[PDB]
């Protein structure tokens, strides 16, 4: 019930208590763990004031006026206004908090070492998918910062019955778009082909390139989605060229700065914000490992491979392992060259192992999900591989929720 | 209760069954994930639904559910329990049992060889010396001179818990490592504790790099006694690499014979605390883990220095590439010697095949992601994108104390 976390390569042990607070469910049991299944209505006005009780409660102690008169009064306004509205709204203070810490729970994210420097937007006065559009322009514009990025966060108008919901419908605010082939191939990316597919049938008008920035499409209080372009401008990106093979440019290989999940869902005291994109800076393994080398993605080993001239016969060459490298290699250092953020793995998870004694020190714990945490590449040489890891759930928190289209009364 | 598992390479998608058979605790609860976690004498009570439940399941597989043998069996085992407050095995069963523990073993990747398991049976060993020269055997055995051979060797199964066989080498073969005055270590660090027990026990230690440590073998509860194996049985490859000549001169090379050598097996309710098993080497388990954690040889930087690689910055993943040439290296010399390896590529692949085999005709394969991953290179291999399912089947391999921290002592 004291839980001890060990580091088998430093042999530093911490404790966790922080667990037991923990709310949600993990999908294990005594009987089957599921640490690496990937995804493991409106709720009651009696489900929705204990949630508003816990949240303000660690909101009144984070702030050290836990049992003040401060405090009972907001339980009290929050109570009645529950009790007469269905609902309550968070004071701005109480939002930035529960956006933070939302950030600081998400036991799978490595970066959260930042996670107390976080820029909130308030768009909760949002009626439009327009206003919605301009709000994002902005989250964009201020997130890019002409290379040097900045984490932020945009919050729309919490669900209110589930008619209304705020929604944006594309997974990430930048994203290539997926195209068919009578080839049967893929042009562009895979993993955005049926968004694409939408897109077209919602009315887009796509260049059919392989790296054209998706349109987003936005979902105003319920009603149907709206086509919108990011003005190019604010999408900024980088050419791939590697520091030694000249030929690596002619691959004609981009990417996007900006990372900028807006598929998920935060719940803050029992609120539902299910429009809420976040943004902070990559790692580079996402690009050059997953988004480049993935099999159901661009999947670009084989012609690299072929480009350095390694022996693709015998998979004992190591050839997808040589090629992986330097591929992550021209990754870090084009955004480099072009001074937009990126941080390579080494650096994140160092960064990552000193955030977690920092929580365990001055938190009690820091939830964490090993499988998501561990790079994608060089694993073991990596601090975080030989950390053990406790993963619980904690709120305020980010969630999966599902994609708009299989949902929407259209 | 059926279970679905997800591959998001390939939207293959399994349902999981034998899930249900599950005994054993994973140290998971609803309310935490202790999946990253390393490490999270019997009753005549206890024993016998231990032994029916194994029983039930070999009959089961031999075809031979409910029928007499079945049955004379189950009186005949239930009989000994009662009389003699444990039982024996059939030479049948045990065979039966340490494969299925070996297929049940959800941090092993190499499991599609699982069938293949050559089981020598050593419950007449009697004394240490004994030990060793079971144990000879099956280095010879699994050697064959290069070309790796599985086995297991089960010495007598655990009675009052005061009479335990134990072998205290973590593996069979492994190096011995120094810690210096100066605080470095010369050798293999993961070893510094046992080389120094066999230190204290007696033994002459030679103080290089890649010593080959001796046997210490405990038998019926007696103290445990050093013996050395023959060096003409311990199979060694010098790491060469393919393109750098000078990758020879770091003065590399390892054993050719992985023989795990301090779990317990466990088959119907009996404890086997000595039980060594041996298959052969996955590349990153040398190239990766042995030669480049930084709590073993860490050789890291000066392969990468000997490659002049750009070392100032992390960013030039100089880490990385000199990770790979190692790895590459490790393979190349193995192959060239003619000793049996398997690269990360190819065993993954293959697991993948063994694992849905498994559903199919088992209804299941319970496996540790966190394991079963390579450690370098991860999302290029197939296991990465796999969902999978953890939980504990028995016959199994169980962790067990080291034997110096429970010993007792007679002099
Ligand atoms: C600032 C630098 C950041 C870095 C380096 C970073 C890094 C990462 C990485 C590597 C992942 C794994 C995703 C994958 O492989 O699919 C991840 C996931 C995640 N991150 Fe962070 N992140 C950062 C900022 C943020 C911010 C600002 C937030 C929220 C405000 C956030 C919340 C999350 C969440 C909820 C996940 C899980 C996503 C999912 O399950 O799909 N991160 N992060
Ligand atoms: C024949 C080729 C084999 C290969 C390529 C192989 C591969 C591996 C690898 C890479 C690991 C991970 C160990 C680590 O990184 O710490 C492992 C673990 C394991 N293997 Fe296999 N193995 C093989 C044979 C066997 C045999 C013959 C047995 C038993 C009869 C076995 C049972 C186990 C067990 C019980 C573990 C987990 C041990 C622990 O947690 O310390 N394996 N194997
Ligand atoms: C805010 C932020 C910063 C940062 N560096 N990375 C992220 C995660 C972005 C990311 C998303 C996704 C899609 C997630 C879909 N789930 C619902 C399964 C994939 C990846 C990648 F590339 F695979 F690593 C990266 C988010
Ligand atoms: C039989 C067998 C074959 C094979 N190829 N590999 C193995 C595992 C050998 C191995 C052991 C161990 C000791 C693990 C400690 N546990 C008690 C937690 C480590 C490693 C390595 F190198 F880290 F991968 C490899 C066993
Ligand atoms: C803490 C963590 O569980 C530990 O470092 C694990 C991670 N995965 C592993 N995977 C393998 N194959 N071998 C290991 O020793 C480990 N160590
Ligand atoms: C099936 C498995 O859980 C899946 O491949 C996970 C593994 N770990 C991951 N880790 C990160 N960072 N991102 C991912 O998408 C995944 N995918
Ligand atoms: O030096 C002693 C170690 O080899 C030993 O404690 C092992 O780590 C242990 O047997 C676990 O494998
Ligand atoms: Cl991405
Ligand atoms: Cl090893
Ligand atoms: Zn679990």
């Not at 709000?135 to 019955?161: E, M, W």
């Not at 979902?219 to 003005?231: M, Y």
């Not at 030929?247 to 290989?253: I, N, P, Q, V």
Request: overall charge neutral.
């Amino acid at each position: 019930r004291f839980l001890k976390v060990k580091n088998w390569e430093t042999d530093v042990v911490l404790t966790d208590t922080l667990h037991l607070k923990s709310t949600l469910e993990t999908g294990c049991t005594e009987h089957i763990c599921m640490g690496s299944i990937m995804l493991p209505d409106v709720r009651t006005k009696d489900q929705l004031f204990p949630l508003a009780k816990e949240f303000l409660d660690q909101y009144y102690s984070s702030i050290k006026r836990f049992g003040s008169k401060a405090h009972m009064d907001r339980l009290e306004e929050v109570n009645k206004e529950i009790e007469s509205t269905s609902t309550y709204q968070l004071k701005d203070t109480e939002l930035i908090y529960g956006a933070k810490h939302a950030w600081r729970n998400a036991s799978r994210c490595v970066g959260r070492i930042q996670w107390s420097k976080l820029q909130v937007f308030d768009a909760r006065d949002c009626t439009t998918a327009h206003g919605m559009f301009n709000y994002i322009c902005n989250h964009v514009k201020y997130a890019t910062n002409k290379g040097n990025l900045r984490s932020a966060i945009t919050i729309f108008p919490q669900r209110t019955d589930g008619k209304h919901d705020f929604r944006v419908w594309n997974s990430q605010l930048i994203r290539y778009a997926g195209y068919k082939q009578p080839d049967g191939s893929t042009l562009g990316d895979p993993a955005n082909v049926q968004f694409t597919e939408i897109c077209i049938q919602q009315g887009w008008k796509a260049p059919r390139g392989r790296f054209d920035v998706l349109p987003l499409l936005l979902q105003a209080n319920g009603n149907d989605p709206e086509l919108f372009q990011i003005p190019p401008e604010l999408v900024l990106e980088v050419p791939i060229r590697h520091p030694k093979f000249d030929w690596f440019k002619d691959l004609g290989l981009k990417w996007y700065g900006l990372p900028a999940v807006s598929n998920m869902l935060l719940e803050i005291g029992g609120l539902e914000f299910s429009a809420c994109p976040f943004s902070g800076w990559y790692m580079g393994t996402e690009i050059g490992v997953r988004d480049y080398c993935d099999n159901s993605r661009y999947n670009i080993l084989e012609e690299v491979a072929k480009k350095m001239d390694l022996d693709m016969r015998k998979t004992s060459s190591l050839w997808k392992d040589q090629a992986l490298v330097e591929i992550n290699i021209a990754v870090l250092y084009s955004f480099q060259s072009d001074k937009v953020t990126i941080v390579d793995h080494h650096s994140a998870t160092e960064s990552f192992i000193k955030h977690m004694e920092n929580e365990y020190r001055c938190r009690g714990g820091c939830p964490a999900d090993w499988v998501w945490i561990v790079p994608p590449m060089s694993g073991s040489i990596t601090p975080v591989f030989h950390q053990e890891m406790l993963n619980y759930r904690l709120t305020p928190s980010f969630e999966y929720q599902p994609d708009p289209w299989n949902t929407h009364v259209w």
